[PDB]
């Protein structure tokens, strides 16, 4: 389908309503590394089995959380391009599943959001690095660290100050323990943005004060469950305040080079000085490497989804065409 447009009415409202009750997972219900999408699936804003179209994901993040349209479009089509089935137009918000339909040829993985090093990556707040064996399940130890950082820097709440300290802590923990730690290009960008999301989108819209309480935080992060009487944010937003997170501990993009404590800056990486390069590399390297010589039908689906991705790209970037026009 076409990317949905912005909300007609972007007011704060009850989103934990009669039509969107929380339900526990049934056998085969897929939850993944994103507490946002997990919660929308667990409240039936998305299909409850965690397999969705890009249009369903965009509508769900807007209606359920008041995620802004451009960010919704960028993230959804980026995720779909690397993790989703472009022919069936289905994306798993977690594990690889036959429910996304017949697979494209290798090297494309269609691994869902669980696929490491496409969208999902290292130094997640409440999920472990893939190197440690699980990049998608809620981790009580990591969450307890989030609670401790909220106690120390947020007066018991998660806010942008906490995000800044925790984002840096999780990077230093990956540097110290993950010899395969990667923090470049797409992951470098999204890792910073995702730390603002709890402060911008998990805070009840009637307060919208950027102070997330730990009960609400656990309910989203662990149980994919809106607080009772949860109001979505009172206006469209995504990553506002990311500048505060970055400013706390400015980092260069880089990777461990096969050993712990070997963090080596990558001058080829995009950073916040080159946002258009992040887009260009995502398309010319990441997407193109999954689909280097696509057949007629995949080429058309790639070109359509690449146009949709570009609609999410901040104005001032030149669209790139790895498969021509
Ligand atoms: C718009 C489509 C969305 C997509 C495709 C998406 C995808 C993802 C993925 C793949 C991750 C895992 C990255 C990683 O940490 O390794 C992630 C993390 C996250 N997402 Fe989403 N997301 C979306 C929207 C949202 C929304 C609306 C929210 C909040 C309401 C949200 C909140 C988060 C948070 C907090 C994390 C970090 C989890 C952690 O580090 O512990 N996302 N997202
Ligand atoms: C927009 O939604 C709010 C909250 O549900 C409601 O109070 C208001 O009447 C709505 N506006 C329109 C144009 O329907
Ligand atoms: C959770 O994270 C901690 C700290 O990184 C790790 O030691 C533990 O093995 C992870 N997994 C579980 C299931 O707790
Ligand atoms: C986070 O909370 C702490 C303690 O209340 C406060 O000092 C800090 O200003 C807050 N940061 C933001 C961005 O609200
Ligand atoms: C992407 O490819 C186009 C030509 O197809 C080129 O104009 C652009 O500079 C390339 N981007 C990068 C990352 O080299
Ligand atoms: C909006 C939401 C998330 C983002 C992640 C990385 C870069 C830019 C973003 C803009
Ligand atoms: Cl919007
Ligand atoms: Mg991760």
Tab-separated table of C-alpha atoms and ligand atoms in Angstrom:
chain	number	residue	atom	x	y	z
A	1	UNK	CA	0.000	0.000	0.000
A	2	UNK	CA	0.955	3.713	-0.044
A	3	UNK	CA	2.624	4.960	3.167
A	4	UNK	CA	-0.256	6.271	5.319
A	5	UNK	CA	-0.398	10.076	5.825
A	6	UNK	CA	-0.195	11.896	9.201
A	7	UNK	CA	-3.042	11.573	11.763
A	8	UNK	CA	-6.057	13.828	10.902
A	9	UNK	CA	-6.528	14.256	14.709
A	10	UNK	CA	-3.203	14.053	16.684
A	11	UNK	CA	-4.745	14.883	20.119
A	12	UNK	CA	-3.799	12.957	23.291
A	13	UNK	CA	-6.438	10.225	23.797
A	14	UNK	CA	-6.958	6.885	25.547
A	15	UNK	CA	-5.184	4.213	23.393
A	16	UNK	CA	-5.550	1.485	26.078
A	17	UNK	CA	-9.286	1.425	25.199
A	18	UNK	CA	-12.035	-1.259	24.888
A	19	UNK	CA	-11.086	-1.934	21.199
A	20	UNK	CA	-7.310	-2.361	22.044
A	21	UNK	CA	-7.084	-4.543	25.193
A	22	UNK	CA	-3.742	-6.064	26.190
A	23	UNK	CA	-3.690	-9.866	25.583
A	24	UNK	CA	-0.896	-12.326	26.468
A	25	UNK	CA	0.989	-14.144	23.659
A	26	UNK	CA	-0.679	-17.198	22.044
A	27	UNK	CA	1.607	-19.956	20.674
A	28	UNK	CA	3.352	-18.579	17.532
A	29	UNK	CA	2.760	-14.870	18.458
A	30	UNK	CA	6.016	-13.053	17.527
A	31	UNK	CA	7.510	-10.306	19.746
A	32	UNK	CA	10.958	-8.803	19.028
A	33	UNK	CA	13.522	-6.175	20.100
A	34	UNK	CA	11.128	-3.170	19.774
A	35	UNK	CA	8.918	-2.491	22.830
A	36	UNK	CA	6.951	0.030	20.674
A	37	UNK	CA	5.868	-2.496	18.013
A	38	UNK	CA	5.556	-5.275	20.668
A	39	UNK	CA	3.042	-3.117	22.629
A	40	UNK	CA	1.031	-2.226	19.480
A	41	UNK	CA	0.800	-5.984	18.621
A	42	UNK	CA	-0.101	-6.895	22.260
A	43	UNK	CA	-2.949	-4.258	22.162
A	44	UNK	CA	-4.095	-5.318	18.651
A	45	UNK	CA	-3.071	-2.015	16.920
A	46	UNK	CA	-1.007	-4.479	14.817
A	47	UNK	CA	-1.919	-8.129	14.122
A	48	UNK	CA	-1.417	-9.850	17.527
A	49	UNK	CA	0.850	-12.555	15.947
A	50	UNK	CA	3.467	-9.784	15.246
A	51	UNK	CA	3.389	-10.034	11.401
A	52	UNK	CA	2.337	-6.750	9.723
A	53	UNK	CA	2.422	-4.742	6.488
A	54	UNK	CA	4.456	-1.510	6.467
A	55	UNK	CA	1.101	0.427	6.214
A	56	UNK	CA	-0.244	-1.405	9.329
A	57	UNK	CA	2.996	-0.570	11.260
A	58	UNK	CA	2.854	3.135	10.192
A	59	UNK	CA	-0.875	3.421	11.123
A	60	UNK	CA	-0.220	1.545	14.432
A	61	UNK	CA	2.736	3.765	15.613
A	62	UNK	CA	0.770	6.951	14.679
A	63	UNK	CA	-2.629	5.946	16.187
A	64	UNK	CA	-1.198	4.128	19.266
A	65	UNK	CA	1.726	6.409	20.266
A	66	UNK	CA	1.480	9.542	18.014
A	67	UNK	CA	4.811	8.622	16.340
A	68	UNK	CA	5.387	11.335	13.671
A	69	UNK	CA	4.683	10.372	10.026
A	70	UNK	CA	8.200	11.005	8.550
A	71	UNK	CA	9.991	8.959	11.273
A	72	UNK	CA	7.288	6.204	11.003
A	73	UNK	CA	7.820	6.062	7.182
A	74	UNK	CA	11.676	6.119	7.429
A	75	UNK	CA	11.978	3.382	10.136
A	76	UNK	CA	9.184	1.144	8.769
A	77	UNK	CA	10.503	1.010	5.136
A	78	UNK	CA	14.123	0.722	6.349
A	79	UNK	CA	13.048	-2.280	8.516
A	80	UNK	CA	10.887	-3.734	5.685
A	81	UNK	CA	13.671	-3.382	3.035
A	82	UNK	CA	16.255	-5.334	5.135
A	83	UNK	CA	14.012	-7.694	7.262
A	84	UNK	CA	10.621	-7.894	5.463
A	85	UNK	CA	9.229	-9.813	2.465
A	86	UNK	CA	8.984	-7.216	-0.352
A	87	UNK	CA	6.757	-9.511	-2.523
A	88	UNK	CA	4.235	-10.420	0.254
A	89	UNK	CA	4.649	-6.907	1.833
A	90	UNK	CA	4.857	-8.613	5.297
A	91	UNK	CA	7.376	-7.931	8.116
A	92	UNK	CA	7.870	-9.958	11.343
A	93	UNK	CA	8.442	-7.641	14.356
A	94	UNK	CA	10.550	-10.530	15.808
A	95	UNK	CA	11.878	-13.944	14.647
A	96	UNK	CA	12.059	-15.155	11.018
A	97	UNK	CA	8.711	-16.832	10.209
A	98	UNK	CA	7.191	-18.734	7.258
A	99	UNK	CA	4.225	-16.315	7.893
A	100	UNK	CA	6.070	-13.594	5.811
A	101	UNK	CA	5.624	-15.967	2.788
A	102	UNK	CA	8.000	-17.496	0.172
A	103	UNK	CA	11.587	-16.197	0.724
A	104	UNK	CA	13.615	-14.217	-1.838
A	105	UNK	CA	16.955	-15.759	-2.916
A	106	UNK	CA	20.076	-15.503	-0.714
A	107	UNK	CA	21.766	-13.267	0.266
A	108	UNK	CA	18.428	-11.673	1.474
A	109	UNK	CA	17.563	-13.150	4.927
A	110	UNK	CA	13.967	-11.778	5.550
A	111	UNK	CA	14.875	-12.442	9.200
A	112	UNK	CA	12.358	-10.064	10.823
A	113	UNK	CA	13.409	-7.314	13.277
A	114	UNK	CA	15.364	-10.029	15.196
A	115	UNK	CA	17.908	-10.153	12.287
A	116	UNK	CA	21.200	-8.798	13.747
A	117	UNK	CA	23.174	-6.088	11.907
A	118	UNK	CA	20.387	-5.041	9.465
A	119	UNK	CA	18.141	-2.846	11.700
A	120	UNK	CA	18.602	-4.397	15.207
A	121	UNK	CA	22.074	-3.890	16.697
A	122	UNK	CA	24.355	-3.658	19.709
A	123	UNK	CA	24.214	-1.512	22.885
A	124	UNK	CA	20.383	-1.871	23.197
A	125	UNK	CA	19.068	-0.601	26.585
A	126	UNK	CA	16.998	-3.691	27.642
A	127	UNK	CA	18.187	-6.341	25.090
A	128	UNK	CA	21.632	-8.040	25.002
A	129	UNK	CA	23.980	-7.863	21.994
A	130	UNK	CA	23.442	-10.779	19.516
A	131	UNK	CA	27.048	-11.939	20.373
A	132	UNK	CA	25.727	-12.947	23.875
A	133	UNK	CA	23.020	-15.161	22.287
A	134	UNK	CA	19.713	-13.165	22.453
A	135	UNK	CA	19.163	-9.723	20.781
A	136	UNK	CA	15.310	-9.628	21.217
A	137	UNK	CA	14.113	-10.878	24.664
A	138	UNK	CA	13.565	-8.406	27.533
A	139	UNK	CA	16.595	-8.737	29.890
A	140	UNK	CA	15.841	-8.169	33.631
A	141	UNK	CA	19.544	-7.350	34.440
A	142	UNK	CA	19.719	-4.680	31.654
A	143	UNK	CA	16.312	-3.269	32.744
A	144	UNK	CA	17.553	-3.140	36.396
A	145	UNK	CA	20.494	-1.086	35.035
A	146	UNK	CA	17.923	1.227	33.317
A	147	UNK	CA	16.109	1.544	36.731
A	148	UNK	CA	19.487	2.289	38.469
A	149	UNK	CA	20.356	4.990	35.830
A	150	UNK	CA	16.784	6.433	36.293
A	151	UNK	CA	17.335	6.501	40.105
A	152	UNK	CA	20.812	8.128	39.718
A	153	UNK	CA	20.137	10.705	36.902
A	154	UNK	CA	16.296	10.980	36.620
A	155	UNK	CA	15.105	11.140	40.269
A	156	UNK	CA	13.546	7.652	39.818
A	157	UNK	CA	12.211	8.470	36.277
A	158	UNK	CA	13.607	7.839	32.766
A	159	UNK	CA	14.265	11.161	30.966
A	160	UNK	CA	16.705	12.495	28.305
A	161	UNK	CA	19.447	12.975	30.990
A	162	UNK	CA	19.115	9.252	31.942
A	163	UNK	CA	19.040	8.371	28.205
A	164	UNK	CA	22.374	10.245	27.720
A	165	UNK	CA	24.147	8.374	30.568
A	166	UNK	CA	22.583	4.944	29.759
A	167	UNK	CA	23.257	5.185	25.979
A	168	UNK	CA	26.979	5.801	26.807
A	169	UNK	CA	27.069	3.029	29.514
A	170	UNK	CA	25.605	0.433	27.077
A	171	UNK	CA	28.227	1.448	24.406
A	172	UNK	CA	31.095	1.136	26.981
A	173	UNK	CA	29.701	-2.294	28.127
A	174	UNK	CA	29.585	-3.482	24.446
A	175	UNK	CA	33.182	-2.152	23.909
A	176	UNK	CA	34.354	-4.010	27.087
A	177	UNK	CA	32.575	-7.390	26.438
A	178	UNK	CA	31.546	-7.785	22.725
A	179	UNK	CA	34.593	-8.345	20.406
A	180	UNK	CA	32.177	-8.024	17.434
A	181	UNK	CA	30.670	-4.709	18.781
A	182	UNK	CA	29.490	-2.632	15.748
A	183	UNK	CA	28.281	0.972	16.149
A	184	UNK	CA	28.266	2.453	12.619
A	185	UNK	CA	25.903	3.978	10.037
A	186	UNK	CA	22.233	2.963	10.557
A	187	UNK	CA	22.686	1.462	14.069
A	188	UNK	CA	24.737	4.531	15.208
A	189	UNK	CA	21.723	6.756	14.264
A	190	UNK	CA	18.846	4.552	15.536
A	191	UNK	CA	20.590	3.648	18.862
A	192	UNK	CA	20.543	7.404	19.818
A	193	UNK	CA	16.937	7.982	18.612
A	194	UNK	CA	15.531	4.872	20.392
A	195	UNK	CA	16.809	6.203	23.792
A	196	UNK	CA	14.487	9.275	23.376
A	197	UNK	CA	11.394	7.162	22.465
A	198	UNK	CA	10.488	6.105	26.049
A	199	UNK	CA	10.720	9.789	27.173
A	200	UNK	CA	8.720	11.028	24.108
A	201	UNK	CA	6.168	8.182	23.581
A	202	UNK	CA	5.793	5.970	26.762
A	203	UNK	CA	4.935	9.048	28.935
A	204	UNK	CA	1.118	9.493	29.317
A	205	UNK	CA	0.137	12.313	26.874
A	206	UNK	CA	-1.808	14.200	29.640
A	207	UNK	CA	1.589	14.866	31.322
A	208	UNK	CA	3.930	14.678	28.232
A	209	UNK	CA	6.664	15.853	30.703
A	210	UNK	CA	9.397	13.468	29.356
A	211	UNK	CA	9.586	11.744	32.822
A	212	UNK	CA	8.820	8.000	32.332
A	213	UNK	CA	8.005	6.132	35.607
A	214	UNK	CA	9.583	2.654	36.129
A	215	UNK	CA	6.151	0.881	36.453
A	216	UNK	CA	5.113	2.199	32.983
A	217	UNK	CA	8.683	1.513	31.708
A	218	UNK	CA	8.564	-2.165	32.854
A	219	UNK	CA	5.003	-2.589	31.448
A	220	UNK	CA	6.157	-1.463	27.917
A	221	UNK	CA	9.722	-2.924	27.905
A	222	UNK	CA	8.883	-6.320	29.528
A	223	UNK	CA	5.133	-6.960	29.032
A	224	UNK	CA	4.423	-4.956	25.812
A	225	UNK	CA	1.517	-3.535	27.878
A	226	UNK	CA	0.238	0.077	28.089
A	227	UNK	CA	-0.438	1.303	31.640
A	228	UNK	CA	-4.152	1.171	32.587
A	229	UNK	CA	-5.815	4.341	31.101
A	230	UNK	CA	-2.679	5.141	28.988
A	231	UNK	CA	-3.082	8.296	26.848
A	232	UNK	CA	-0.809	8.574	23.782
A	233	UNK	CA	1.338	11.755	23.386
A	234	UNK	CA	-0.628	14.967	22.600
A	235	UNK	CA	1.204	15.695	19.281
A	236	UNK	CA	3.231	13.784	16.644
A	237	UNK	CA	6.891	13.197	17.715
A	238	UNK	CA	9.747	10.648	17.506
A	239	UNK	CA	13.368	11.518	18.373
A	240	UNK	CA	13.090	15.118	19.729
A	241	UNK	CA	15.781	15.590	22.449
A	242	UNK	CA	18.236	13.175	20.714
A	243	UNK	CA	20.628	16.208	20.684
A	244	UNK	CA	20.676	16.020	24.561
A	245	UNK	CA	21.513	12.238	24.458
A	246	UNK	CA	24.404	12.806	21.949
A	247	UNK	CA	25.655	15.972	23.755
A	248	UNK	CA	26.048	14.012	27.063
A	249	UNK	CA	28.820	11.727	25.612
A	250	UNK	CA	29.595	12.497	21.937
A	251	UNK	CA	30.878	9.254	20.302
A	252	UNK	CA	32.392	8.586	16.838
A	253	UNK	CA	30.966	5.614	14.879
A	254	UNK	CA	33.229	2.549	15.091
A	255	UNK	CA	33.556	-1.140	15.933
A	256	UNK	CA	35.599	-3.528	18.049
A	257	UNK	CA	38.052	-5.199	15.587
A	258	UNK	CA	37.588	-8.855	16.741
A	259	UNK	CA	38.724	-8.179	20.362
A	260	UNK	CA	37.175	-6.467	23.424
A	261	UNK	CA	38.488	-2.903	24.138
A	262	UNK	CA	39.598	-2.423	20.465
A	263	UNK	CA	37.042	0.305	19.524
A	264	UNK	CA	38.281	1.691	16.172
A	265	UNK	CA	36.603	4.723	14.533
A	266	UNK	CA	35.301	4.029	10.982
A	267	UNK	CA	35.929	7.106	8.768
A	268	UNK	CA	33.707	5.457	6.051
A	269	UNK	CA	30.730	5.471	8.529
A	270	UNK	CA	28.002	8.132	8.418
A	271	UNK	CA	27.657	10.198	11.642
A	272	UNK	CA	25.365	13.117	12.658
A	273	UNK	CA	27.487	15.453	10.399
A	274	UNK	CA	26.517	13.300	7.321
A	275	UNK	CA	22.843	12.218	7.715
A	276	UNK	CA	22.391	11.934	3.888
A	277	UNK	CA	25.443	9.550	3.763
A	278	UNK	CA	23.636	7.240	6.305
A	279	UNK	CA	20.661	7.034	3.835
A	280	UNK	CA	22.960	6.620	0.759
A	281	UNK	CA	24.959	3.769	2.410
A	282	UNK	CA	21.780	2.074	3.734
A	283	UNK	CA	20.499	1.905	0.101
A	284	UNK	CA	23.759	1.467	-1.949
A	285	UNK	CA	25.419	-1.018	0.504
A	286	UNK	CA	22.916	-2.627	2.982
A	287	UNK	CA	19.815	-3.000	0.689
A	288	UNK	CA	21.942	-3.670	-2.482
A	289	UNK	CA	23.971	-6.393	-0.629
A	290	UNK	CA	20.725	-8.258	0.329
A	291	UNK	CA	19.439	-7.893	-3.305
A	292	UNK	CA	22.504	-7.497	-5.600
A	293	UNK	CA	20.819	-8.758	-8.848
A	294	UNK	CA	17.043	-8.889	-8.160
A	295	UNK	CA	14.585	-10.553	-10.632
A	296	UNK	CA	11.885	-8.390	-12.346
A	297	UNK	CA	9.216	-8.656	-9.555
A	298	UNK	CA	11.690	-8.028	-6.654
A	299	UNK	CA	13.282	-5.085	-8.518
A	300	UNK	CA	9.824	-3.408	-8.820
A	301	UNK	CA	9.012	-4.105	-5.093
A	302	UNK	CA	12.515	-2.789	-4.063
A	303	UNK	CA	12.087	0.381	-6.232
A	304	UNK	CA	8.565	1.031	-4.774
A	305	UNK	CA	9.773	0.504	-1.130
A	306	UNK	CA	12.951	2.595	-1.793
A	307	UNK	CA	10.682	5.496	-2.999
A	308	UNK	CA	8.606	5.060	0.229
A	309	UNK	CA	11.856	5.058	2.331
A	310	UNK	CA	12.947	8.339	0.603
A	311	UNK	CA	9.635	10.044	1.694
A	312	UNK	CA	10.900	9.481	5.299
A	313	UNK	CA	14.299	11.108	4.495
A	314	UNK	CA	14.734	14.699	5.864
A	315	UNK	CA	14.596	17.250	2.962
A	316	UNK	CA	18.043	18.232	1.536
A	317	UNK	CA	19.106	14.633	0.611
A	318	UNK	CA	19.340	13.450	-3.061
A	319	UNK	CA	17.416	10.168	-3.704
A	320	UNK	CA	19.738	7.318	-4.897
A	321	UNK	CA	18.687	4.599	-7.401
A	322	UNK	CA	20.682	1.343	-6.970
A	323	UNK	CA	18.336	-0.416	-9.504
A	324	UNK	CA	17.880	2.602	-11.852
A	325	UNK	CA	14.441	4.336	-12.162
B	1	LIG	C1	8.100	2.995	13.229
B	1	LIG	C2	8.458	1.707	13.146
B	1	LIG	C3	9.363	1.098	14.146
B	1	LIG	C4	10.297	0.186	13.812
B	1	LIG	C5	10.417	-0.420	12.437
B	1	LIG	C6	11.064	-0.076	14.986
B	1	LIG	C7	12.112	-1.000	15.008
B	1	LIG	C8	12.950	-1.169	16.077
B	1	LIG	C9	13.995	-2.116	16.180
B	1	LIG	C10	14.400	-3.128	15.136
B	1	LIG	C11	14.571	-1.958	17.403
B	1	LIG	C12	15.719	-2.738	17.958
B	1	LIG	C13	17.013	-1.919	17.801
B	1	LIG	C14	18.000	-2.426	18.803
B	1	LIG	O1	17.961	-1.944	19.965
B	1	LIG	O2	18.830	-3.321	18.505
B	1	LIG	C15	13.884	-0.933	18.059
B	1	LIG	C16	14.171	-0.521	19.324
B	1	LIG	C17	13.315	0.286	20.028
B	1	LIG	N1	12.161	0.814	19.644
B	1	LIG	FE1	11.350	0.630	17.921
B	1	LIG	N2	10.610	0.670	15.986
B	1	LIG	C18	9.613	1.431	15.573
B	1	LIG	C19	8.840	2.329	16.284
B	1	LIG	C20	8.967	2.585	17.626
B	1	LIG	C21	8.061	3.315	18.438
B	1	LIG	C22	6.811	4.029	17.969
B	1	LIG	C23	8.586	3.279	19.734
B	1	LIG	C24	8.057	3.809	21.001
B	1	LIG	C25	6.739	3.936	21.174
B	1	LIG	C26	9.770	2.507	19.672
B	1	LIG	C27	10.555	2.258	20.754
B	1	LIG	C28	11.714	1.505	20.678
B	1	LIG	C29	12.643	1.428	21.817
B	1	LIG	C30	12.498	2.043	23.181
B	1	LIG	C31	13.634	0.632	21.421
B	1	LIG	C32	14.871	0.258	22.204
B	1	LIG	C33	14.842	-1.063	22.934
B	1	LIG	C34	16.089	-1.175	23.792
B	1	LIG	O3	17.182	-0.619	23.458
B	1	LIG	O4	16.031	-1.820	24.864
B	1	LIG	N3	9.968	2.097	18.395
B	1	LIG	N4	12.873	-0.467	17.253
B	2	LIG	C1	-9.915	14.903	18.322
B	2	LIG	O1	-9.778	13.877	19.314
B	2	LIG	C2	-9.994	14.398	20.631
B	2	LIG	C3	-9.588	13.368	21.692
B	2	LIG	O2	-10.246	12.107	21.482
B	2	LIG	C4	-11.457	14.827	20.750
B	2	LIG	O3	-11.723	15.291	22.082
B	2	LIG	C5	-11.771	15.907	19.709
B	2	LIG	O4	-13.173	16.180	19.756
B	2	LIG	C6	-11.365	15.409	18.316
B	2	LIG	N1	-11.485	16.392	17.238
B	2	LIG	C7	-12.189	16.133	16.122
B	2	LIG	C8	-11.923	17.032	14.947
B	2	LIG	O5	-12.950	15.176	16.016
B	3	LIG	C1	21.062	-10.390	30.451
B	3	LIG	O1	22.107	-9.422	30.482
B	3	LIG	C2	23.165	-9.783	31.362
B	3	LIG	C3	24.178	-8.637	31.347
B	3	LIG	O2	24.633	-8.390	30.017
B	3	LIG	C4	23.768	-11.117	30.932
B	3	LIG	O3	24.852	-11.465	31.795
B	3	LIG	C5	22.694	-12.195	30.910
B	3	LIG	O4	23.256	-13.425	30.442
B	3	LIG	C6	21.603	-11.723	29.956
B	3	LIG	N1	20.570	-12.725	29.755
B	3	LIG	C7	19.705	-13.131	30.670
B	3	LIG	C8	18.795	-14.231	30.228
B	3	LIG	O5	19.650	-12.664	31.800
B	4	LIG	C1	15.868	14.149	34.557
B	4	LIG	O1	15.472	14.131	35.923
B	4	LIG	C2	16.457	14.729	36.779
B	4	LIG	C3	16.019	14.617	38.234
B	4	LIG	O2	14.662	15.069	38.352
B	4	LIG	C4	16.636	16.197	36.412
B	4	LIG	O3	17.661	16.825	37.193
B	4	LIG	C5	16.983	16.359	34.948
B	4	LIG	O4	16.894	17.751	34.654
B	4	LIG	C6	15.975	15.619	34.101
B	4	LIG	N1	16.304	15.789	32.685
B	4	LIG	C7	15.379	16.090	31.778
B	4	LIG	C8	15.831	16.232	30.367
B	4	LIG	O5	14.203	16.262	32.060
B	5	LIG	C1	25.117	5.686	-4.330
B	5	LIG	O1	25.088	5.378	-5.722
B	5	LIG	C2	24.864	6.546	-6.521
B	5	LIG	C3	24.888	6.135	-7.989
B	5	LIG	O2	24.016	5.020	-8.115
B	5	LIG	C4	25.905	7.638	-6.260
B	5	LIG	O3	25.472	8.843	-6.892
B	5	LIG	C5	26.110	7.922	-4.778
B	5	LIG	O4	27.258	8.757	-4.590
B	5	LIG	C6	26.310	6.603	-4.061
B	5	LIG	N1	26.449	6.700	-2.618
B	5	LIG	C7	27.553	6.280	-2.001
B	5	LIG	C8	27.369	5.832	-0.575
B	5	LIG	O5	28.629	6.126	-2.565
B	6	LIG	C1	13.453	9.891	13.797
B	6	LIG	C2	13.322	8.707	14.537
B	6	LIG	C3	14.378	7.865	14.682
B	6	LIG	C4	15.628	8.158	14.085
B	6	LIG	C5	16.744	7.298	14.210
B	6	LIG	C6	17.922	7.604	13.616
B	6	LIG	C7	18.064	8.786	12.870
B	6	LIG	C8	17.020	9.643	12.732
B	6	LIG	C9	15.765	9.354	13.331
B	6	LIG	C10	14.637	10.211	13.209
B	7	LIG	CL1	3.009	13.234	11.807
B	8	LIG	MG1	19.784	-4.596	19.787
